[PDB]
């Protein structure tokens with residue numbers, strides 16, 4: 665039993681809810697919240713900009729030190745950093761950005777990072793300002809992640825479309 669509330673169950677291990685991931689994180693304080701990161705951990709907009717704003721920019725300060733030490737992530741890769749006031753840990757995962765021409769096949773590699781964590785609160789990778797089809801992202805999630813994932817979808821219209829079209 666865990667504290668996630670109000671989710672629709674899609675499969676054995678994948679759950680989905682129309683929710684603001686920032687507000688969901690503040691309430692649940694999950695072990696892991698996933699950020700929709702870029703390789704530079706520049707959290708300017710989308711999910712990343714919103715999570716960083718909720719940490720009062722502490723996420724960005726920590727991220728800048730990480731990059732100065734380690735260099736950029738790979739598209740499809742991840743790193744574990746602090747969850748600040750939102751979660752124990754933040755898993756920063758880089759899905760491909762279609763608006764940069766990145767190979768959508770890398771989306772499966774991106775979701776594989778979730779399998780290193782037993783339970784996660786996450787957005788749909790490569791959705792939103794990353795330019796991929798969220799229906800496709802949900803399909804890759806279900807077909808790749810084997811650990812327990814609680815997906816937060818900000819847009820109610822998109823949420824209803826994702827549920828109604830789910831196979």
Ligand SMILES: O=C(N[C@H]1c2cccc(O)c2C[C@H]1C(=O)O)c1cnc2c(c1)CCCN2
Nearest residue numbers: 686700710711714788789790791792818819
């Ligand atoms: O862009 C947002 N989400 C989308 C997003 C962003 C970045 C990467 C992604 O793969 C996605 C999928 C989108 C979604 O999940 O629908 C977003 C933007 N601003 C916000 C919030 C969410 C929630 C807190 C308040 N401010």
